Design a protein around this ligand. Sequence first.
Ligand code: GDP
Ligand code: MG
Length: 169
Amino acid sequence: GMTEYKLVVVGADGVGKSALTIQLIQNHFVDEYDPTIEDSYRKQVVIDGETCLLDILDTAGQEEYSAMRDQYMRTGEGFLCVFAINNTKSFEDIHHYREQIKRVQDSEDVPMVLVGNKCDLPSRTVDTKQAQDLARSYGIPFIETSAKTRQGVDDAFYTLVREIRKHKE
Ligand SMILES: Nc1nc2c(ncn2[C@@H]2O[C@H](COP(=O)(O)OP(=O)(O)O)[C@@H](O)[C@H]2O)c(=O)[nH]1
Ligand SMILES: [Mg+2]
């Protein structure tokens, strides 16, 4: 059976969680995707010559009960922690998402990547140094992305898979 990597995209409303997932899946930028919709996506990819499947939950932070949400948070192998480089509050919110992950996983060693999205925008209020400093503090990679231009999108998901492989070895 083809190895599957169960991945979970988390972060504040409006950082580009849906746009990043749809760019990876459909290879286009969606300007408009209902902020309250949480759905999973499955995509076959080749990472360093290994054919594998990514099983991705795009989270929406809604209150309504979802058996699927609970399952992915509990059994997810890797987390993308997304903020927007032009949204200081979304960067300030990252510590909350990391705490939620450690608690549901009951582990201090969960594979994670810090994702700074919307790097196409000039109005940057979160600099590369402060993002690299937070990622260093957590012992995780930092990747700059644009869902709009596709800059760093494969790099973000593929780096998370490389972190999961390391954790499995
Ligand atoms: N300029 C730019 N806009 C983005 C990017 N990613 C998402 N957006 C826009 O930011 C808004 C929120 O995106 P969305 O994917 O709904 O965020 P979510 O709430 O995290 O799922 C939408 O208007 C998107 O079109 C990006 O990389 N660059
Ligand atoms: Mg969304």
